[PDB]
Curated annotation (Swiss-Prot), chain A:
This is Histone deacetylase RPD3. One of its GO terms (biological process) is meiotic cell cycle. Changing L319A: Strongly reduces HDAC activity. It is found in: Cytoplasm; Nucleus. The lineage of its organism: Eukaryota, Fungi, Dikarya, Ascomycota, Saccharomycotina. Component of the RPD3C(L) complex composed of at least ASH1, CTI6, DEP1, PHO23, RPD3, RXT2, RXT3, SAP30, SDS3, SIN3, UME1 and UME6. Component of the RPD3C(S) complex composed of at least EAF3, RCO1, RPD3, SIN3, and UME1. Interacts with cyclophilins CPR1, CPR6 and CPR7, with the kinase HOG1, and with ESS1, CYC8 and HAC1. InterPro entries: HDAC_PDAC, His_deacetylse, His_deacetylse_1, His_deacetylse_dom, His_deacetylse_dom_sf, Ureohydrolase_dom_sf. It comes from Saccharomyces cerevisiae (strain ATCC 204508 / S288c) (Baker's yeast).
Curated annotation (Swiss-Prot), chain B:
Present with 1660 molecules/cell in log phase SD medium. Component of the RPD3C(L) complex composed of at least ASH1, CTI6, DEP1, PHO23, RPD3, RXT2, RXT3, SAP30, SDS3, SIN3, UME1 and UME6. Component of the RPD3C(S) complex composed of at least EAF3, RCO1, RPD3, SIN3, and UME1. Interacts with ESS1 and STB1. The chain holds residues 688 to 1322 of 1536 of the full protein. Catalytic component of the RPD3 histone deacetylase complexes RPD3C(L) and RPD3C(S) responsible for the deacetylation of lysine residues on the N-terminal part of the core histones (H2A, H2B, H3 and H4). Histone deacetylation gives a tag for epigenetic repression and plays an important role in transcriptional regulation, cell cycle progression and developmental events. SIN3 also has a RPD3 independent function required for normal longevity. Disulfide bonds: none annotated. It comes from the Eukaryota. The gene is SIN3. This is Transcriptional regulatory protein SIN3. It is found in: Nucleus.
Curated annotation (Swiss-Prot), chain C:
It comes from Saccharomyces cerevisiae (strain ATCC 204508 / S288c). A zinc finger (PHD-type) spans 37-86, 165-223. Component of the RPD3C(S) complex composed of at least EAF3, RCO1, RPD3, SIN3, and UME1. It comes from the Eukaryota. This is Transcriptional regulatory protein RCO1. Signal peptide: none annotated. The gene is RCO1. It is found in: Nucleus. Catalytic component of the RPD3C(S) histone deacetylase complex responsible for the deacetylation of lysine residues on the N-terminal part of the core histones (H2A, H2B, H3 and H4). Histone deacetylation gives a tag for epigenetic repression and plays an important role in transcriptional regulation, cell cycle progression, DNA damage response, osmotic stress response and developmental events. Present with 486 molecules/cell in log phase SD medium.
UniProtKB/Swiss-Prot annotation, chain D:
This is Chromatin modification-related protein EAF3. Component of the NuA4 histone acetyltransferase complex composed of at least ACT1, ARP4, YAF9, VID21, SWC4, EAF3, EAF5, EAF6, EAF7, EPL1, ESA1, TRA1 and YNG2. Component of the NuA4 histone acetyltransferase complex which is involved in transcriptional activation of selected genes principally by acetylation of nucleosomal histone H4 and H2A. The NuA4 complex is also involved in DNA repair. Present with 1890 molecules/cell in log phase SD medium. Residues 1-180 form the MRG domain. It comes from the Eukaryota. It is found in: Nucleus. Belongs to the MRG family.
Length: 391, 495, 290, 182
């Protein structure tokens, strides 16, 4: 809607990491999203930024000392001797290790703290971090099939400028660690959309809205196996409208998870480009400070398509469906158009069930009313452009 | 539940919740309670009193426990009640698409890591070549080679070389540069050239495979539609549905109507549905020619009689038994299946005539091959007329089912899942309308329908006291205007 | 005409997998010529184990009385608890009189290192006293634990037990819907205890769970009702020689804190509905005065 | 042979088993009540409620024998697979300040009752005379009878979710993962 200054941080090292063979969750989607953004000519209203690797003693702001020290010491050649810390944090059993793991966590946490600092100094209204998005882990855990929770690393880094923080999770495999870390405090409100069925987090309920000062201030909605665009609009607009009319947040952290797209390895939702765009569009419509972060997406074509669409609209330009030639020209679909087609799969959700969720949510919410900190030390990294327009 | 409150154990709010969720259909009991009643901790995410935390001496000085949590945590196992994890439902198409996509990702990741390594190495090479050899001989460096990443070059060296050779190669590189640099550059660039020359056709075959598999994978309802219609197009299922609909308006929460669905907004459906029935009857082989003519004339007469059509070219009540009612229900089923196509025809037609292929894909032969080029495209003509010509051709047997389904899902963008089995549903309609003249009671029922259609306290007596007592009866109401039919199911209650 | 088997590209990696072409060369100009078991004998579990020779079993690194971290290996070869005495007048007679004040437990303390450490299992006369408690696969407390078209609903709305239709309690609508428009169909899950029908919209549920603890219909007594506080945990049921007993003689201000078997040590007392009605009206009256 | 475990205490053992395995809860390490205080309450209470013809001698002898039994047989049969790493860290903390490994004064009466219930499992597989067995069974039955009256004070029905006096600490995700791993 209104004109906004959108900042986007990307590290080239994020792309060249492979989690493993047969691995759905992977970092290669970030480099192709970056390439699509670079080749779509979005640089006219954008600035490029380089994500500095996370400093060790500031990385420990969320996690424990031994967990970070293990992550900086973990590698495939010594995982066999690392058995205790391998099984203690669910590392190598469900989430295998690889070369450059600590590098990935460092650059992801650096990008998240960079977005938080850009929010703090206020030069850019919106920060986009596709490089991070690791949003399932916990203080001493790699559960939820990831390794870090860099959103909660970036949320508290923006607490100093933003007292009230609002977080939204729209993809499946919701933010167990995100709502867990900010359970008992009203300062950060965690909203998450997920399905009751068993997922990588597994958690999420309708009665776990908070304890202590954070009571009634962490709303979770249990959804069903696939939502139509109209039903998702009817379940998203009133809830977020009531939240912004009651909570009065001063910041928004939006999880741009591609896991809820029409067809991926573990996703089970059926939203098209319109359905995924309205989540960001609605929370953009209030103009309060914003931080877009993305970690979801098991299929490259769908998550790259929706990330290019989000990058397009976020700058208030008309993003066309045609894809310019790039290194991934023969990648996205047969017709090579930027549109994720919603599958012909049934709408399990009920309007009566949605109305019941609305009524109990409204009745729930009616009762309520470190040597480098706050720093933006980085480099633009736009001197050389790797635009491959030649076959 | 009543006793637990009397034992001073159950709380007021808990008892109130149990009461308000026990009842709730009617509210006079709610106000009866509210006259004289005097009126979080989820399944997971529970408290840890003494978890291993509070270690403020490892660089975590402040802003680490203010709004943070280490006492209220949760695991996926606890919320799953110790049952493991369940995977998403899939089939062969989705897993093979995942496999091809993942291996394409693997190839592209290896190429991209290799080119990043080769570009870092070429800046290293020119920055060590531009000056003399005196400082080339002594170039001791820390790990990283001047970049921000420490393990990428080790990773690609391990990938291209052996396991134990990669570590010593990395060690040499680090300690003795400008010696093995030209040979390692030549080897890596030769590997990159061979990988790219393989990829220049490997991407082509990958794309050709995807162009056929992706549309089928995007279907999640039409793959099992055949078995669904095999196990759901039964008499008992239909009886179950109409009884379930009729018991939703009973007492203890009747009505003269049992169904307000099955609207008839347009009469253009009858024209081309009769054309489809005519051509399928013309292209049948298990029926006799006089029987074919009899079926044709009976269908034409029934369609011209029940509805307001005039047969240009190729309050009233109806009481129906199971067979006729099932015939009418199947007719409105196909009516709604075609109305789902007709209602959304405008914007899909607009997007398919305004669809433009991009210009850069016309250079490197990125066109789709052996998928739809025989004339299966819907451009240049009406989508509905083209799809019905497609259905007639499929009935003709000269066009296979796979291409029919592929064109159906491609043209309407997975919005024509109901037309995946139109030939089978019209075949079933034909052979079950064969049962109408096969016996004599259904013929008499049809004769009574013809008698009472053209210009009714005796209808119930005639429709009850003329058969065996134990059989199902249905009532269909037809309105003069708006063509809005309604079906009422009454049986074993008028005697 | 996909034709995938025709082209193989054997000169480079093949089928996601990598061949031995990368390891087939050894020319570099860089150096410029200068028994055990799957299960366990302690907890019947599978995992990391230590190799043994004197015995044919395997034990975990953290399942020993002097447990040792796996990263720090013990010096030499580790032996089990009874493996120390496996290679090696009775010693019991002198061991009894060797120490004082342990005489009745002298034989019990003698047998400490003669057998392996193991996880605790309840004896053969404790769990079976309650029929609701059954042994688990690995030692769990077993009490109640074990995307297509509209066709889910006929498979759930018909149990084929009596050829009838099950109707939900909150709303008297089965809502099977129609085949032409299946969006009005609602999934119904039945209870695993009393087979009470329930719509997925009346109770806040969004999926069917068939692994783990069975779903409880919310029309029963609470298991952990909370009222410093009190945590009621029932008194279970006893099937051992009808020990639970039935003694109805008072049914007045009984104050039996619940746990009633309604009719028309541990003691599951018998209650009648007339007493429940009477003391409900008594409590209602006493609430009316206060 | 088998001692008469009362049905209330059988329910207590089944509840503890549920808490350990299904609910994933372990007992308080720094328990307010251990075996030392329950035996102190025994000697403070049961001595004056009966005459003294000499029964105090073998009464205290059985108490001392039980106390000695609870040390070595704790790490042999007890410690459900969840509690192995808590035992490891307890002995590591005991060895940190050069204190002797004495685990009897750490665990509460739940493990004491569990050791009481596990007696017939290994009593039968040894040459152990019935003459002392009858007296031991009778006095242990007296022990369970005493515990019956004290069951509300000693095993009060509380959970580790809103207070710290529930004689239980709940498992953490890392501790749950590493306890059942090895």
């Amino acid at each position: 809607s209104d004109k906004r200054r959108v900042a986007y941080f990307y590290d080239a090292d994020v792309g060249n990491y492979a989690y493993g063979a047969g691995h759905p969750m992977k970092p290669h989607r970030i480099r192709m999203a970056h390439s699509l953004i670079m080749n779509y000519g979005l640089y006219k209203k954008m600035e490029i930024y380089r994500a500095k690797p996370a400093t060790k003693q500031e990385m420990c702001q969320f996690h424990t000392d031994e967990y970070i020290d293990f992550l900086s010491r973990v590698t495939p050649d010594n995982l066999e001797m690392f058995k205790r810390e391998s099984v203690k944090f669910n590392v190598g059993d469900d989430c295998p290790v690889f070369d450059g793991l600590y590098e990935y966590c460092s650059i992801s946490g650096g990008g998240s703290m960079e977005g938080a600092a850009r929010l703090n100094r206020g030069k850019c209204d919106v920060a986009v971090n596709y490089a991070g998005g690791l949003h399932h882990a916990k203080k001493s855990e790699a559960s939820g099939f990831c390794y870090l929770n860099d959103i909660v690393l970036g949320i508290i880094e923006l607490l100093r400028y933003h007292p009230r923080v609002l977080y939204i999770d729209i993809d499946v495999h919701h933010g167990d660690g995100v709502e867990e870390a900010f359970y008992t405090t009203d300062r950060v409100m965690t909203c998450s959309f997920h399905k009751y069925g068993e997922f990588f987090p597994g958690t999420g309920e309708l009665r776990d809205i908070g304890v202590g000062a954070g009571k009634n201030y962490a709303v979770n909605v249990p959804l069903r196996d696939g939502i139509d665009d109209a039903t998702y609009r009817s379940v998203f607009e009133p809830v977020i409208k009531k939240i912004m009319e009651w909570y009065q947040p001063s910041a928004v952290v939006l999880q741009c998870g591609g896991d809820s797209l029409s067809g991926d390895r573990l996703g089970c939702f059926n939203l098209s480009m319109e359905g995924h765009a309205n989540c960001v569009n609605y929370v953009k419509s209030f103009g309060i400070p914003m931080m877009v972060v993305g970690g979801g997406g098991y299929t490259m074509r769908n998550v790259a398509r929706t990330w290019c669409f989000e990058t397009g609209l976020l700058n208030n330009v008309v993003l066309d469906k045609d894809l310019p030639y790039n290194e991934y020209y023969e990648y996205y679909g047969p017709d090579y158009k930027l549109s994720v087609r919603p599958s012909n799969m049934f709408n399990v959700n009920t309007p009566e069930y949605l109305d019941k969720v609305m009524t109990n949510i409204f009745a729930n919410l009616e009762n309520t009313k470190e040597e480098d900190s706050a720093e933006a030390k980085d480099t633009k990294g736009g001197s050389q452009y790797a635009r491959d327009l030649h076959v | 539940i009543l006793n637990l409150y009397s034992q001073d154990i159950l709380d007021l709010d808990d008892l109130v919740e149990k009461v308000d969720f026990y009842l709730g259909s009617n509210k006079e009991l709610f106000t009866w309670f509210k006259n004289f009643v005097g009126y979080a901790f989820g399944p997971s995410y529970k408290r840890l009193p003494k978890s291993d935390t509070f270690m403020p001496c490892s660089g975590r000085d402040d802003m680490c426990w203010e709004v943070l949590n280490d006492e209220w945590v949760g695991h996926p196992v606890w919320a799953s009640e110790d049952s493991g994890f369940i995977a998403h439902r899939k089939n062969q198409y989705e897993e093979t698409l995942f496999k091809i996509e993942e291996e394409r990702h693997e190839y592209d990741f290896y190429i991209e890591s290799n080119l990043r390594t080769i570009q870092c190495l070429e800046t290293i090479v020119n920055k060590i070549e531009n000056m003399t050899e005196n400082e080339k001989a002594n170039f001791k460096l820390p790990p990283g080679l001047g970049h921000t990443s420490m393990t990428i070059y080790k990773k690609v060296i391990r990938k291209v070389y052996d396991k134990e050779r990669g570590f010593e190669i990395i060690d040499a590189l680090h300690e003795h540069p400008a010696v093995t640099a030209p040979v390692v550059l030549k080897r890596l660039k030769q590997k990159d050239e061979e990988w790219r020359r393989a990829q220049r056709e490997w991407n082509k075959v990958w794309r050709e495979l995807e162009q056929k598999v992706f549309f089928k994978s995007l279907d999640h309802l039409g793959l099992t539609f055949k078995q669904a219609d095999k196990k759901l197009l039964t008499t008992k299922q239909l009886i179950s549905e109409i009884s379930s609909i009729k018991v939703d308006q009973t007492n203890k929460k009747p009505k003269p109507k049992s169904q307000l669905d099955f609207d008839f907004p347009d009469k253009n459906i009858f024209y081309d549905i009769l054309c489809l029935a005519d051509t399928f009857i013309t292209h049948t082989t298990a029926y006799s020619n006089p029987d074919k003519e009899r079926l044709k004339d009976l269908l034409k007469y029934f369609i011209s009689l029940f509805f307001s059509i005039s047969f240009e070219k190729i309050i009233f009540n109806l009481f129906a038994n199971t067979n006729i009612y099932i015939f009418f229900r199947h007719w409105t089923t196909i009516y709604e299946r075609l109305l789902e196509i007709k209602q959304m025809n405008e914007r899909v037609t607009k997007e398919i005539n305004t669809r433009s292929t991009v210009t850069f894909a016309k250079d490197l032969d990125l066109l789709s091959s052996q998928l739809s080029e025989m004339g299966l495209d819907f451009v240049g003509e009406d989508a509905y007329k083209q799809v019905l010509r497609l259905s007639r051709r499929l009935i003709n047997g000269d066009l296979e089912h796979q291409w029919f389904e592929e064109s159906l899902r491609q043209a309407y963008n997975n919005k024509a899942f109901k037309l995946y089995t139109i030939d089978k549903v019209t075949q079933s309609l034909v052979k079950h309308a064969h049962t109408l003249m096969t016996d004599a009671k259904t013929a008499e029922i049809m004769a009574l329908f013809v008698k009472d259609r053209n210009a009714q306290i005796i209808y119930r007596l005639q429709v009850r006291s003329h058969m065996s007592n134990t059989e199902n009866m249905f009532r269909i109401e037809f309105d003069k205007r708006t063509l809005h039919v309604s079906i009422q199911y009454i049986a074993l209650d008028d005697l | 005409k996909k034709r995938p088997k025709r082209l193989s590209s054997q000169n480079v990696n093949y089928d996601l997998k990598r061949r031995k072409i990368i390891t087939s060369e050894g020319i570099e100009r860089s150096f410029k010529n200068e028994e055990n078991e799957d299960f366990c004998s302690a907890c019947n579990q599978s995992g990391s184990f230590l190799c043994c020779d004197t015995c044919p079993k395997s034990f975990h690194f953290l399942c020993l009385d002097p447990p040792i971290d796996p990263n720090n290996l013990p010096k030499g070869d580790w032996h089990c608890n009874e493996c120390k005495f496996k290679i090696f007048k009775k010693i019991e007679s002198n061991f009894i009189k060797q120490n004082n004040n342990v005489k009745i437990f002298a034989k019990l303390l003698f047998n400490i290192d003669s057998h392996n450490p193991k996880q605790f299992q309840l004896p053969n006369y404790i769990k079976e006293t309650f029929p609701a408690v059954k042994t688990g696969s690995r030692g769990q407390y077993s009490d109640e634990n074990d995307t297509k078209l509209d066709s889910y609903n006929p498979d759930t709305h018909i149990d084929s037990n009596s050829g009838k239709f099950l109707i939900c309690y909150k709303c008297n609508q089965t809502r099977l819907g129609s085949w032409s428009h299946p969006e009005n169909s609602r999934l119904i899950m039945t209870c695993d205890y009393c087979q009470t029908p329930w719509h997925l919209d009346c109770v806040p549920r969004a999926s069917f769970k068939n692994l783990g603890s069975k779903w409880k219909c919310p029309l029963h007594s609470p298991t952990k009702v909370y009222k410093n506080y009190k945590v009621w945990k029932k008194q279970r049921l006893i099937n051992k020689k009808n020990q639970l007993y039935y003694e109805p003689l008072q049914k007045i201000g009984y104050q039996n804190n619940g746990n009633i078997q309604i009719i028309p040590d541990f003691k599951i007392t018998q209650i009648d509905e007339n007493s429940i009605k009477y003391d409900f009206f008594d409590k209602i009256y006493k609430s009316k005065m206060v | 042979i088998s001692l008469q475990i009362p049905i209330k205490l059988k329910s207590v053992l089944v509840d503890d088993w549920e808490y350990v395995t299904k609910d994933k809860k372990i007992c308080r390490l720094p328990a307010d009540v251990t075996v030392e205080m329950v035996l102190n309450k025994y000697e403070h209470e049961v001595s004056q409620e009966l005459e003294s013809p000499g029964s105090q001698s073998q009464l205290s002898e059985y108490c001392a024998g039980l106390k000695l039994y609870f040390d070595k047989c704790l790490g042999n049969m007890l410690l459900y697979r969840l509690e192995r790493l808590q035992y490891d860290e307890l002995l590591k903390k005991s060895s940190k300040d050069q204190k002797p490994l004495v685990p009897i004064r750490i665990y509460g009466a739940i493990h004491l009752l569990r050791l009481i219930s596990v007696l017939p499992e290994l009593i039968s597989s040894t040459t152990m005379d019935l003459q002392s067995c009858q007296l031991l069974i009778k006095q242990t039955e007296d022990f369970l009878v005493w515990l019956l009256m004290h069951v509300d004070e000693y095993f009060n029905d509380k959970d580790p979710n809103r207070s710290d006096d529930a004689l239980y600490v709940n498992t953490s995700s890392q501790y749950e993962g590493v306890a059942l791993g090895m």
